[PDB]
């Protein structure tokens, strides 16, 4: 058997708030965020027929604002105001319910963990490196 | 050769091994590994959130400063077609 | 039965709802509240060019940040680019903290009970930290002498190998010794004694575990006298 | 002026926290920024200058426990508040001269904002590396 | 257990009281809880639907776990420390070279 010292309890680092959700899920979140905002931009501003184009207030940047606002539990001032952008927005509302309710289930367990580091186990770096001695 | 097998058969070796290793569980993790403390949140847990907050403040302020810098002093509908064709 | 010193439990005070954070966090959130709102003011009223077009001021901004923090909505939104890009940061800031708050208040409102130490006397055989003894010239001391269950045998071994004497001479002696040992000396006596000591002031003692056997008090007569059958 | 006075006092200070420690090896502690001075013992008022030297498991480039210490036992974020604060005090002092350009005192308050932005970071990292 | 088996003899000769009660239940069985070969008891547990447990040795257990259809499972820990060996008739010259 191999005896080494005790290690020190590594407390979790800076970017540990996003820890309970995996990086792939965060990636798909960013992609879906962009896609929902762009599709909602497409539904409006589609020659609505002297106001024949400025019927709504949804620019691309306003939609980019609205999506991020709807995601984090504070709705903005404007509303989709017409059909077929709203069967985007309701689906996005269903999405933001099911995601962040899954986010905030057990968040407090993820900010006090203190797992160990364990440099070597099946030694073989005692062959490879020169640093830690052994006898 | 006949006696060691008697001890192995009757579990005397198990009893002695329990006495001289497991009844003297003293240090730390063996005794206290199956307990529970609730919580108390300290600032050392939540620091990067404040870091992101303050950095975003500085970024937004810098954005407004260069906005006021530019408005103190796309382009060519037309070459947007060039831009979208090379983008496609 | 086994008698020990009752550990002094903590009572929830008046302001027992600010518990799942610490006071450092409570002052830092106040500081950051002030800073975020004044930066939003600074970025709003900055001579854009006409001037009274935008709606933000110090006062509007002060309660906008609070109405964003507690989920109560608002009345107005930042429309300038940098105002939006500073408001989104505060939106991200609240979603970590208030979620942590609710999720940990859910942890504080489940359990308040202590972890209950050396119960059922097996760790009294296992550990070497807290000592324990009986009464001298005592039936319990003789019972642990003559007992043949192995855990009781190891307890008798520890009691006979004692530095100093774990044994006492009278009951109140061991009572005072446990009241002053601060959880370092356990004590063995009988269940009626134990509950009587529990039902007195200062109530600093505590019965732990269950029982061990079934003894009984009786009337004792000399052997062969005529008093036996009428008693 | 009051803010500059209080910040320079708070920097030039050995009395921030009070805990139980030592005075000088090899006790209620009158501890401050680096002078971990002490009282109520064999001697009262011998201010040892402290820095970082643990005896760890040899953390090599453990950045959140190393660069954090590097910002801790060299106050740069707390000291920059004084710098920006007097830098803005110079601009509010220079308001009267070179005036009627209606532009200069806007630059002043930016320093007063950003100095507090430095201050809050210094407070966070100080409490962080106290419990570090 | 397995008949003509060292484990069955071990529960016969064993003196720990829980093992004694297990031997009591095994000797008072209706019908026979004992089997004749290993695969017999394997199929009996695969068809008993959690109504007949089985006792064997750990190497056998992990080998049956590492095969198809993986419908079996090792539970608990071990019980003792036995060992396989090479067996020779008593007194021959092969003993010390083997
Ligand atoms: C802005 N306004 C007035 C237009 C909408 C009202 C705010 C919505 C308040 N809901 C806050 C949350 C409560 C629980 C369930 C989810 C996730 C978190 C726990 C946070 C939402
Ligand atoms: N009734 C017991 C009390 C002391 C003891 O339990 O050892 C006796 O007289 O011996
Ligand atoms: N090795 C054992 C297998 C059977 C058992 O464990 O009872 C024997 O030959 O007896």
Residue B25 CA from chain centroid, whole number: 31
Strands D28-31 and D35-38: antiparallel
Smallest CA–CA distance, residue B4 to chain E, in Å, is 13
User: With helix as H, strand as E and coil as C, how does chain C read?
Assistant: CEEEECCCCCCCCCCCCCCCCCHHHHHHHHHHHHHHHHHHHHHHCCCCCCCCCCCCCHHHHHHHHHHHHCCCCCCCCCCCHHHHHHHHHHHHHHHHHHHHHHHHHHHHCCCCCCCCCCHHHHHHHHCCCCEEECECCCHHHHHHHHCCCHHHHHHHHHHHCCCCCCCECCHHHHHHHHHHHCCCEEEECCHHHHHHHHCCCCCCEEEECCCCCCCCCCCCCCCCCCCCCCC
CA dihedral D40, D42, D43, D46 (to 10 degrees): -90
Residues annotated within a binding site of C for L-glutamate: 139-140, 190
Could you tell me the two tokens for D62?
């453990």
Q: Which helix (H) or strand (E) holds D49?
A: strand D48-49
Q: How many other CB atoms sit within 10 Å of the CB of residue C209?
A: 15
Give chain B's length: 88
Atom of ligand 1 nearest to the CA of C95: 20
d(CA A46, CA A52): 10
Please, are residues D83 and A33 in contact by the beta-carbon 8 Å criterion?
A: no
Cβ–Cβ below 8 Å for B11 and E80: yes
- Residue D54's alpha-carbon distances to C39, D27, D57, in angstroms, are 39, 20, 9
Nearest to C90 by CA among C60, C116, C106, C67: C67
- Residue C35's alpha-carbon distances to B42, C29, C81, C94, in angstroms, are 21, 10, 19, 15
Q: Is E93 annotated as a binding residue?
A: no
What resolution in angstroms, rounded to 1 decimal? 4.4
The finding on whether A75 has its CB within 6 A of some atom of ligand 1 is yes
Q: Which helix (H) or strand (E) holds E44?
A: helix E38-48
CATH for D1-132 is: 1.20.140.150
* Interchain CB contact of A108 with B (< 8 Å): yes
d(CA A121, CA E53): 37
Domain ranges of chain D: 1-132
DSSP string, D68-114: HHHHHTS-SHHHHHHHHHHHHHHHHHTTSTT-SSS-HHHHHHHHHHH
The finding on whether C179 has its CB within 6 A of some atom of ligand 2 is no
Could you tell me the two tokens for D73?
């036992």
Q: What are the counts of helices (DSSP H) followed by strands (DSSP E) for chain E? A: 4, 0
Please, are residues A71 and A102 in contact by the beta-carbon 8 Å criterion?
A: no
DSSP string, B16-85: HHIIIIITT--STHHHHTT--------TTTS-HHHHHHHHHHHHHHHHHHHHHHHTT---STTTHHHHHH
Burial (0-12, 13-18, 19+ Cβ within 10 Å), E83 = exposed
Supply the residue whose CA is at minimum distance from atom 4 of ligand 1.
A75
Give chain A's length: 135
d(CA E5, CA D1): 95
Place of tokens 């397995």: E2
* Interchain CB contact of C19 with B (< 8 Å): yes
Long-range (24+ apart) CB contacts under 8 A made by D44-49 are: D47/D14, D48/D23, D48/D24
Mutate to test the pocket of ligand 3, among E1, E4, E5 (most ligand atoms within 8 A of CB): E5
Chains C and E touch (3+ CB pairs under 8 A): no
Q: Is E6 annotated as a binding residue?
A: yes
**Ligand 3, CB cutoff 6 Å, lining residues:** E 2, 5-8, 57
Smallest CA–CA distance, residue B28 to chain A, in Å, is 13
Residue C220 C-alpha to ligand 2 middle, in angstroms? 14
Name the β-bridge partners of C206. C4
DSSP state of A10: B
Please, are residues D36 and D21 in contact by the beta-carbon 8 Å criterion?
A: yes
Please, are residues D125 and D77 in contact by the beta-carbon 8 Å criterion?
A: yes
Burial (0-12, 13-18, 19+ Cβ within 10 Å), C175 = middle
Please, are residues A115 and A10 in contact by the beta-carbon 8 Å criterion?
A: yes
Please report how many Cα atoms fall inside a 13 Å half-sphere around the Cα of residue C200, on the Cβ side.
7
Smallest CA–CA distance, residue A108 to chain B, in Å, is 8
Atom of ligand 2 nearest to the CA of C217: 1
Nearest to A107 by CA among A17, A24, A22: A17
The experimental method, as deposited, was: cryo-EM
Residue of D nearest to B55 (CA): D117
Please, are residues A86 and A92 in contact by the beta-carbon 8 Å criterion?
A: no
Q: What is the CA radius of gyration of chain B?
A: 36
SS3 E78: coil
Please, are residues C25 and B46 in contact by the beta-carbon 8 Å criterion?
A: yes
């Amino acid at each position: 058997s191999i005896m080494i010292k005790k290690p020190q309890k590594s407390k979790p680092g800076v970017f540990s708030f996003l820890d309970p959700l995996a990086y792939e899920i965060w990636m798909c979140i960013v992609f879906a965020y962009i896609g929902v905002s762009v599709v909602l931009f497409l539904v409006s501003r589609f020659s609505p027929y002297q106001s024949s184009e400025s019927t709504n207030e949804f620019g691309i940047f306003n939609s980019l604002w609205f999506s991020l606002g709807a995601f984090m539990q504070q709705g903005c001032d404007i509303s989709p105001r017409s059909l077929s952008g709203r069967i985007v927005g309701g689906v996005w509302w269903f999405f933001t319910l099911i995601i962040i309710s899954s986010y905030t289930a057990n968040l407090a367990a993820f900010l006090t963990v203190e797992r160990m580091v364990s440099p070597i186990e099946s030694a073989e770096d005692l062959s490879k490196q020169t640093e830690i001695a052994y006898g | 050769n006949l006696a060691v097998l008697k001890l192995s058969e009757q579990g005397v070796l198990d009893k002695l091994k329990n006495k001289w290793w497991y009844d003297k569980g003293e240090c730390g993790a063996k005794d206290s590994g199956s307990k529970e403390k609730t919580s108390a949140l300290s600032l050392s847990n939540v620091a990067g959130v404040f870091y992101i907050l303050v950095g975003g403040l500085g970024l937004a302020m810098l954005v407004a400063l260069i906005e006021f810098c530019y408005k103190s002093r796309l382009f060519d509908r037309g070459v947007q077609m060039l831009l979208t064709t090379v983008g496609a | 039965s086994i008698m020990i010193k009752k550990p002094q439990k903590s009572k929830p005070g008046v302001f027992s709802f600010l518990d799942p954070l610490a006071y450092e966090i409570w002052m830092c959130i106040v500081f950051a509240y002030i800073g975020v709102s004044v930066v939003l003011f600074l970025v709003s009223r900055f001579s854009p060019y006409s001037e009274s077009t935008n709606e933000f001021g110090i006062f509007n901004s002060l309660w906008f940040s609070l109405g964003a923090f507690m989920q109560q909505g608002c009345d107005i939104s930042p429309r300038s680019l940098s105002g939006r890009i500073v408001g989104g940061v505060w939106w991200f800031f609240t979603l970590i903290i208030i979620s942590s708050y609710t999720a940990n208040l859910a942890a504080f409102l489940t359990v308040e009970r202590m972890v209950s130490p050396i119960e059922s006397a097996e760790d009294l055989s296992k550990q070497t930290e807290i000592a324990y003894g009986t009464l001298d010239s005592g039936s319990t001391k003789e019972f642990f002498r003559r007992s043949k269950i192995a855990v009781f045998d190891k307890m008798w071994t520890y009691m006979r190998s004692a530095e100093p004497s774990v044994f006492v001479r009278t009951t109140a002696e061991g009572v005072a010794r446990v009241r002053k040992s601060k959880g370092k000396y356990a004590y063995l006596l009988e269940s009626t004694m134990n509950e009587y000591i529990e039902q007195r002031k200062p109530c600093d003692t505590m019965k732990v575990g269950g029982n061990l056997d079934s003894k009984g008090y009786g009337i004792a007569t000399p052997k062969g006298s005529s008093l036996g059958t009428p008693v | 002026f009051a803010a500059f006075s209080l910040m320079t006092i708070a920097v030039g200070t050995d009395y921030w926290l009070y805990s139980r420690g030592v005075c000088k090896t090899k006790v209620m502690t009158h501890s401050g920024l680096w002078r971990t001075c002490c009282l109520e013992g064999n001697f009262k008022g011998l201010c040892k200058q402290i820095d970082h030297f643990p005896e760890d498991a040899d953390y090599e480039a453990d950045t959140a426990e190393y660069f954090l210490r590097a910002v801790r036992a060299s106050s740069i974020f707390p000291i920059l508040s004084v710098i920006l604060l007097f830098m803005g005090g110079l601009c509010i002092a220079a308001s009267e001269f070179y005036k009627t350009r209606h532009n200069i005192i806007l630059s002043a308050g930016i320093f007063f904002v950003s100095a507090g932005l430095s201050n809050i970071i210094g407070i966070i990292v100080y409490i962080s590396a106290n419990a570090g």
